RNA sequence: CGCGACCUCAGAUCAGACGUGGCGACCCGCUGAAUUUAAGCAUAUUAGUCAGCGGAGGAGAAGAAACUAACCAGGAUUCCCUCAGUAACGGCGAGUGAACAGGGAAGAGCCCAGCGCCGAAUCCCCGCCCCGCGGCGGGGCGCGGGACAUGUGGCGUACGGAA
RNA sequence: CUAAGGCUAAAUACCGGCACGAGACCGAUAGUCAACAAGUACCGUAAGGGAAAGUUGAAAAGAACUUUGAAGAGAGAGUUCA
RNA sequence: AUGCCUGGGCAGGGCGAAGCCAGAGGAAACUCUGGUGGAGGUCCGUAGCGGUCCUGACGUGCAAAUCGGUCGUCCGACCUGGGUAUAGGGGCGAAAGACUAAUCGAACCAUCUAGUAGCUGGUUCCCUCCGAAGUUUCCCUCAGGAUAGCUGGCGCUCUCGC
RNA sequence: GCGGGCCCGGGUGGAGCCGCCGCAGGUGCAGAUCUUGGUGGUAGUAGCAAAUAUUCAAACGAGAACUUUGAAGGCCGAAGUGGAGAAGGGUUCCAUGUGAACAGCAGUUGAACAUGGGUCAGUCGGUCCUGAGAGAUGGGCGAGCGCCGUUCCGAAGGGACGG
RNA sequence: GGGCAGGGCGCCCUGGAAUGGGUUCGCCCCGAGAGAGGGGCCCGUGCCUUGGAAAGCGUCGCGGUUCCGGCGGCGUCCGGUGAGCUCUCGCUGGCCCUUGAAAAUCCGGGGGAGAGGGUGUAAAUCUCGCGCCGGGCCGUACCCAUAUCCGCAGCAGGUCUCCAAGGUGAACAGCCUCUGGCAUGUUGGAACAAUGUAGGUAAGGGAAGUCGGCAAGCCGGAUCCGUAACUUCGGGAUAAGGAU
RNA sequence: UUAAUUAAAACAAAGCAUCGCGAAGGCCCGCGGCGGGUGUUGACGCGAUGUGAUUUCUGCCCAGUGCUCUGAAUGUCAAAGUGAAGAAAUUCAAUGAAGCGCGGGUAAACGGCGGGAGUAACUAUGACUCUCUUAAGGUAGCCAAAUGCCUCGUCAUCUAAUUAGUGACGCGCAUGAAUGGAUGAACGAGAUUCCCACUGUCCCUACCUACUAUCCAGCGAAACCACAGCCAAGGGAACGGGCUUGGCGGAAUCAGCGGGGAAAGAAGACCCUGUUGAGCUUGACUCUAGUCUGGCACGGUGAAGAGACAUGUUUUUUCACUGAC
RNA sequence: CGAUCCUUCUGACCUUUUGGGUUUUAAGCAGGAGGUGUCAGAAAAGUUACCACAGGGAUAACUGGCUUGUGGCGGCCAAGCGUUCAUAGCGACGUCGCUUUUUGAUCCUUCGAUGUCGGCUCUUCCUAUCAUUGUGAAGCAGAAUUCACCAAGCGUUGGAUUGUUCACCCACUAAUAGGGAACGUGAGCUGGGUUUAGACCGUCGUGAGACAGGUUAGUUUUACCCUACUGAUGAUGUGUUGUUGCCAUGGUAAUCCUGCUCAGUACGAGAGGAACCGCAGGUUCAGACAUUUGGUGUAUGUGCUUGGCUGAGGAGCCAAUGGGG
RNA sequence: CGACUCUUAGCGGUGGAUCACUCGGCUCGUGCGUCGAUGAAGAACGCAGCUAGCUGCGAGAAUUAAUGUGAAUUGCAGGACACAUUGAUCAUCGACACUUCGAACGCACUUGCGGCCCCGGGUUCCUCCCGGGGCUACGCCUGUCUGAGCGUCGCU
């Protein structure tokens, strides 16, 4: 009864998609993620799981804004200027 | 090593009172100028049954002598109180049943209910189903009055605190046998999750100090000190005497 | 019976700014064990270590003696060698364990409160004019506002200072 | 020596980030889990767990065309040094 | 597993508690007879819920617990959906150390951690030379160590069929 | 060559390799219920046996016990093997085509594969309300991320009529 | 929408009743006003009518090779019953030491703060009848289970509901049938050896078998009789035992 | 009620009996707070236990361990405070809370409730009597019980035959009164004995049906495998398929079968060892939350009085106020 | 009779007590004591049947091995019993042996597992012979009885009680003899009792818990591999086929009882009471067969019937073989 | 001689071992050492003629502008360009642009409900309605405005 018969009545889900980390870990009743802790301002991470930190770190994503910062620093963060016109 | 039953009642969330259908706290009328000096009249509208409480309650409608509005209070109904009856409350209120007035005014030997432990707490003593308190003596000096509680103890209280004349309606419930586990289940379903009680000797020695053993016995004296840590204070707590 | 100053305290979609989170190899402040060793184990050891929390920068922290020494004295802080597996600590068992001087890398010193003298001699905000304004400054013109005597600025701080 | 007030670069550290150089190091069961659409596929409700997988040929010149079979498949022919 | 909130559901029959009507007896108290009535943590029994026996089938199965007959209960301490609360030395338990996602006399995940083992197992080419002990003493010592003993290697000091 | 192994002949192979003097090591396997990958006997064997049942003719088709059509015989026998929903699934729904792989035989069939198509709201529901409960501000605690609590140590309504 | 049946009233007017009466399956009611008359209100999901016969359905005959949502004649009728099943409405009771939700939202009433035009007009219409404009966003396919979900799978397991015909029969029991559905449940053919799994039957004995009547078998429904010990007087009880 | 070996006599249950608490309280949660549950509560309530329908009864014991009551008549008693001498660090002395000692209560608190001799005109038993002892020495009841080693106790019944069953006896290893005794209608998928009927359980087996097994077409694994597989005796790690001596042995197979392969599974669940652990208990060793008590600070104002030192100081006892709380 | 560490005492005009000097205190140097009885010297209570891990056949609970104390069985001498008489039948006090069908001693194999006590079923073997066949001896007159020899061919039963091995009783019989085969036999069965987890009683323990003390409920997996066995095709040679046969080799099978006559005879005082040859039959076992009797029965053969379905009659069908002759 | 079985060899199958290759790792060292309310890290959804994944991009969505270079991209068509022209692709990148969540900011997370101003459709501001644009979170500093107090004071 505790085995195959019990697996039949898994009808209602307890987790949904979190809107901050995107993972299916948002607990419906507690309204807490447990993967990133969305209601908490700070992101959830720990030093006892280094692989988890490596999975979601700065280099993993798009880096849409930081990649431009790298080149802008590499040239000198110049603003409001144009190259010599032809 | 497991936490015993009785400690888990403090946390709650399973032993909390069932207050879903309760009609409200049965508090006496608040003290005001009319109560303190004269008296104010109210009209009894209906007598209501409060789940989890043997004694019936009575809804009494007053009028606020500061704003144009009708105040409503939920008193504990005394024996003989009927609908459409005028009930008075104040220092000058007369000595009739279902009439709340200070104990100092009432003469000795008066039977009262819903007695105030402190002046202005709106009723705390002798209000269960049919219990009543009796005033024994008055002390004009220091404004003190002696009252005998239904437990048999005599307590000294201030003369300012009020009480309702008469006994609490609905007495004699304990005379009728329950006769069934089902009736006990229905009775305790409206109060708490505490009715099905397992004996400590019938438990394992991990969840109760009285459990364990090849014979269903206690093995230790049932009496325990009042200065005992939680998880051990079971049985007869600070028993002066034990037997019949 | 109202108004006018002050002191404490609120409201703002009031004017102009600031903090929030991320990373976290290196750094700073807390909290903080048990595996293990002692052929067992409780003090010890593991170990101010891992785990947990908070806070920055390109470095951080520290830093110019309420010092070291007892010598014919040295002279901020930081790091390297040595001191030294030493003094010392420890069921004085297992084990733990620095500092001074010496040789180097580098080397940089200073500022307030108070004490007192100068007519608050001081500072912030808004208007106009001139320069440049893409890390919003300088000067001048404003009986235009505010802060400040419950103390701003100049001289001046232990190596003495002021007249 | 003058505590209970404050500031300060250099010699110091840097398994993260940006851009370079090198090796008595390994050579696809090795070297990072990941030489390849790898934190990907996939597993668990979740915290998390987590792979396998490089090589035609110098050049596709990648087998026109004939024939049996419904086709998969063959027999000839052709390309290429193979 | 338990508490709470909001919904849904439970054929057909038997027995016949109060209350009520009529008749008969009585001096009264009241008592008999025949009806009506439908109460019961009532009975047989279906759906539902559960799982006693055959210790049947199966037992690399349909199935990491199912199947056939036979069974207990079936208006109440009843069965059930959704929402919500209680989280690991904690919860919950009509109490079996039972349940807590196929794990419960202390769940799962990652780290400390390559935890420790006097205890098992394994330990990779050839040839040549030498070649053992299971014994003394001490140890919370008896499946182990230290220490003497047995072994090998490296030499050195000398004598000589000179 | 005692041996560890080595030198030539032939074939395949197509691009690097070895001897000697020294140096260095992640340097020699038969076992560890060793790790990974592959392959045998078993073996064309166990098995393709829970719930009564199929038959005839024609059509398409290379191919028919399993497709379709018609006829006959059956079962589920309104608590159904019928008709619709909720949770869940997420294109599995519909039309056309293929038969590479899967549907433990086959298939001309499919929930397989490849192309396209399909979900039309004021009235049907979400949206509104509150229940059990959860959870901010004020307040308190906490080294700290935060926690306690939902009226309790609050100047808590920015609304309205009439003038 | 309008009208009318049919139910309910703890609504009203005349009047005062023992020789008590009215009345239900049961109850219950009456000088705090019963029977008898006359009214009023609520629901009217039922019947007639607008909608609406124009449409739908069953028949008979055609237009058009085809496309073609067509054209037409007819009918869609009259009655009775039932502790019959289901749904719904309404009265009446029984049980609780159980008394069986909150809020949003809508409405009625008590008061008269105030407005109106002044003798034909106005302020007002919890708007009386029409007339004009708008109603945004999200989901909508299909399966919903011996094959579309969870069990590694087209797994004999598990998974919340609604609709509910005829016969027999107490019955939503079992069996047969109609509407609807399907091909026998991951294959077929040929024989009927032993062992099996699932059903049975056995002369005479009747538990002698076995730890043990395990398993199987016996009785079984209804009607008419009858029913003991014991007892908490309620039961035992379908006791047991007979006939049809 | 132990999902997946135990549905029961186990748990629960109404009834019965005790314990604590009148709110700055009882029980409990919580690292923390003017925190929280019971509690929308108030002794006919809440919290903690034991027993377990109805009837009857509930015997004795406070010696022990618990629990509880008061008590300056008080032995021991820490910190802080007071005095002493010393140059001081100091040590000594006096004072001295709770708790332990001391004194009562309580067994429906945990629990317990003996032994040796003599003695009635046949024997036997034994009324009755004596001694030692504890806190009483088992009272009413009941039994060879679910409880009795001897034991298959003794007698009767039930059978032709009974270690079974029932009914009586008590001598009870080791029954017994809310750790409840006895009884008891109805009920029980609870454990046993006998009887009626019934039957393949059996004497003693046979036959029939359906699906398998069988053969065929198609599709097709897994466990296991040092090498393999005919025996007798011998020796051997004391029970060999292999070795020795003998008996002997002939391709490839099919359907059964369970003697052997000390057959397959799981680094034996039993026992022992380890200076290996875990659940639980306590009169084991170290501790700890909580809790009781004393001192210091928050901690103020007024009015009376005494002791002690000394010839102003401390301790301060009581009463009164509120502005802290 | 006692190490380190620690404490304590004793001794020096002893050293240090750190910038110097004095004085207390403290630390050193040397010698005694305070003690470790597990005595070359840890500070240390239980339970686990809810249990876990690493191992051990270095170590227990089986079988099997050595031995035979013990158990069982058999001899040697002959004091005596036997009315007389040691040896028909027995046999003390002593002494010599055999078996491993009893319990013991040992720990040799097995703890990376060899499934245990009984019962049921089945085969074979031993003789230490209960009965039957053939015989010897008597305290053998007949009958009966025991002692002994060749001898295991064929038999050694049905039941009440108990799980039982064992044991006791009832009945029949010629007899109801004793044993082995891993204390034969669980991929042959069952699970009744031991022997996990749930519970009850009694004793013990403060307690968790323990009891060769009782009670109750408690999952028995897999063969399709090799061999062995049971059957079925087959195989090497005979030139190929077929018919009729022989035979080496293996297996082997029949057993016991009753009645009549003998004969109421032999024998015997009597009571009682035989045997051989013959006749009629029975028990157990083996090999066959269905004429008869019985069983089965779906030839689904033929009637009879319940409910439903083809409109009804007729003829039929469905209800896992509808039911019944 | 058969079939089956055993050893060896040639060839043919299953398998991918060995060797040689390597736009990848590991280790050491040098310089620099830069995120975010002017909206970070991360996530979601979309963007190509034919486009699933990877990579790149953000409704200006396989890239816009400018600078340098100078004739392509390419799997196929289509082509823009005259490559004597800012002129195809590339690299640089300083201008512009940059959807929705997310410290995430009107209230909650359904993509649901709102308030304060301006413009247009409708109007001829008239409020309903529709579309577009800008605001509306917490804490905190300076300053401004409006306030309260039986807080401390002064005049009447
Ligand atoms: Mg228990
Ligand atoms: Mg305990
Ligand atoms: Mg250790
Ligand atoms: Mg060790
Ligand atoms: Mg240890
Ligand atoms: Mg430390
Ligand atoms: Mg600093
Ligand atoms: Mg220095
Ligand atoms: Mg040195
Ligand atoms: Mg100054
Ligand atoms: Mg790799
Ligand atoms: Mg079974
Ligand atoms: Mg099987
Ligand atoms: Mg237990
Ligand atoms: Mg290691
Ligand atoms: Mg050892
Ligand atoms: Mg040598
Ligand atoms: Mg040698
Ligand atoms: Mg087969
Ligand atoms: Mg059927
Ligand atoms: Mg359906
Ligand atoms: Mg389809
Ligand atoms: Mg197929
Ligand atoms: Mg009337
Ligand atoms: Mg639909
Ligand atoms: Mg299927
Ligand atoms: Mg079938
Ligand atoms: Mg089929
Ligand atoms: Mg028979
Ligand atoms: Mg039975
Ligand atoms: Mg009876
Ligand atoms: Mg179970
Ligand atoms: Mg069971
Ligand atoms: Mg008690
Ligand atoms: Mg006592
Ligand atoms: Mg019997
Ligand atoms: Mg006793
Ligand atoms: Mg007892
Ligand atoms: Mg072998
Ligand atoms: Mg076998
Ligand atoms: Mg082992
Ligand atoms: Mg040891
Ligand atoms: Mg331990
Ligand atoms: Mg136990
Ligand atoms: Mg051994
Ligand atoms: Mg003997
Ligand atoms: Mg004779
Ligand atoms: Mg045996
Ligand atoms: Mg066997
Ligand atoms: Mg078995
Ligand atoms: Mg058993
Ligand atoms: Mg047990
Ligand atoms: Mg005891
Ligand atoms: Mg007929
Ligand atoms: Zn998240």
TrEMBL record, chain B:
<dbReference type="GO" id="GO:0022625">
    <property type="term" value="C:cytosolic large ribosomal subunit"/>
</dbReference>
<dbReference type="InterPro" id="IPR014726">
    <property type="entry name" value="Ribosomal_uL2_dom3"/>
</dbReference>
<dbReference type="InterPro" id="IPR002171">
    <property type="entry name" value="Ribosomal_uL2"/>
</dbReference>
<dbReference type="InterPro" id="IPR008991">
    <property type="entry name" value="Translation_prot_SH3-like_sf"/>
</dbReference>
<dbReference type="Pfam" id="PF00181">
    <property type="entry name" value="Ribosomal_L2_N"/>
</dbReference>
<dbReference type="InterPro" id="IPR022669">
    <property type="entry name" value="Ribosomal_uL2_C"/>
</dbReference>
<comment type="similarity">
    <text>Belongs to the universal ribosomal protein uL2 family.</text>
</comment>
<comment type="subunit">
    <text>Component of the large ribosomal subunit. Interacts with CRY1.</text>
</comment>
<keyword id="KW-0694">RNA-binding</keyword>
<dbReference type="InterPro" id="IPR022666">
    <property type="entry name" value="Ribosomal_uL2_RNA-bd_dom"/>
</dbReference>
<keyword id="KW-0699">rRNA-binding</keyword>
<feature type="domain" description="Large ribosomal subunit protein uL2 RNA-binding">
    <location>
        <begin position="10"/>
        <end position="89"/>
    </location>
</feature>
<feature type="binding site">
    <location>
        <position position="19"/>
    </location>
    <ligand>
        <name>Mg(2+) 2</name>
    </ligand>
</feature>
<dbReference type="InterPro" id="IPR012340">
    <property type="entry name" value="NA-bd_OB-fold"/>
</dbReference>
<feature type="binding site">
    <location>
        <position position="210"/>
    </location>
    <ligand>
        <name>Mg(2+) 3</name>
    </ligand>
</feature>
<feature type="domain" description="Large ribosomal subunit protein uL2 C-terminal">
    <location>
        <begin position="95"/>
        <end position="230"/>
    </location>
</feature>
<dbReference type="Pfam" id="PF03947">
    <property type="entry name" value="Ribosomal_L2_C"/>
</dbReference>
<dbReference type="InterPro" id="IPR014722">
    <property type="entry name" value="Rib_uL2_dom2"/>
</dbReference>
<feature type="region of interest" description="Disordered">
    <location>
        <begin position="206"/>
        <end position="231"/>
    </location>
</feature>
<keyword id="KW-0687">Ribonucleoprotein</keyword>
<keyword id="KW-0479">Metal-binding</keyword>
<feature type="binding site">
    <location>
        <position position="217"/>
    </location>
    <ligand>
        <name>Mg(2+) 3</name>
    </ligand>
</feature>
<dbReference type="InterPro" id="IPR022671">
    <property type="entry name" value="Ribosomal_uL2_CS"/>
</dbReference>
<feature type="binding site">
    <location>
        <position position="216"/>
    </location>
    <ligand>
        <name>Mg(2+) 4</name>
    </ligand>
</feature>
<feature type="binding site">
    <location>
        <position position="2"/>
    </location>
    <ligand>
        <name>Mg(2+) 1</name>
    </ligand>
</feature>
<keyword id="KW-0689">Ribosomal protein</keyword>
<protein>
    <recommendedName>
        <fullName>Large ribosomal subunit protein uL2</fullName>
    </recommendedName>
</protein>
<dbReference type="GO" id="GO:0003735">
    <property type="term" value="F:structural constituent of ribosome"/>
</dbReference>
<feature type="binding site">
    <location>
        <position position="207"/>
    </location>
    <ligand>
        <name>Mg(2+) 1</name>
    </ligand>
</feature>
<dbReference type="GO" id="GO:0019843">
    <property type="term" value="F:rRNA binding"/>
</dbReference>
<dbReference type="GO" id="GO:0002181">
    <property type="term" value="P:cytoplasmic translation"/>
</dbReference>
């Amino acid at each position: 009864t505790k085995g195959t018969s019990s697996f039949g009545k898994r009808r209602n889900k307890t987790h949904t998609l979190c809107r901050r980390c995107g993972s299916k870990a948002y607990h419906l009743q507690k309204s807490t993620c447990g993967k990133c802790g969305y209601p908490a301002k700070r992101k959830r991470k720990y030093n006892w799981s280094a692989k988890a930190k490596r999975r979601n770190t700065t280099g993993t994503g798009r880096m849409r804004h930081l990649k431009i910062v790298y080149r802008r620093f590499r040239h000198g963060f110049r603003e409001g200027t144009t190259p010599k016109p032809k | 090593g497991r936490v015993i039953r009785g400690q888990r009642k403090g946390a709650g969330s399973v032993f909390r009172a069932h207050v879903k259908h309760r009609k409200g706290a049965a508090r006496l009328r608040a003290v005001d100028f009319a109560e303190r000096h004269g008296y104010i009249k109210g009209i009894v509208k209906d007598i209501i049954h409060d789940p989890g409480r043997g004694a019936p309650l009575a809804k009494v409608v007053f009028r606020d002598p500061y704003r144009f509005k009708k105040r409503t209070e939920l008193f504990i109904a005394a024996e003989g109180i009927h609908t459409g009856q005028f009930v008075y409350c104040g220092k000058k209120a007369q000595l009739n049943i279902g009439n709340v007035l200070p104990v100092g005014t009432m003469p000795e030997g008066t039977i009262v209910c819903c007695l105030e432990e402190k002046p202005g707490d709106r009723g705390k003593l002798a209000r269960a189903s049919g219990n009543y308190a009796t005033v024994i003596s008055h002390n004009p000096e220091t404004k003190k009055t002696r009252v005998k509680l239904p437990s048999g103890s005599k307590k000294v209280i201030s003369s300012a605190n009020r009480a309702v004349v008469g006994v609490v309606a609905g007495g004699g419930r304990i005379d009728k046998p329950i006769l069934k586990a089902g009736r006990a289940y229905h009775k305790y379903k409206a109060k708490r999750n505490c009715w099905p009680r397992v004996r400590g000797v019938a438990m394992n020695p991990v969840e109760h100090p009285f459990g364990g053993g090849n014979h269903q016995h206690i093995g230790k004296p049932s009496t325990i000190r009042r200065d005992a840590p939680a998880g051990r204070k079971v049985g007869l707590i600070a028993a002066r005497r034990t037997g019949r």
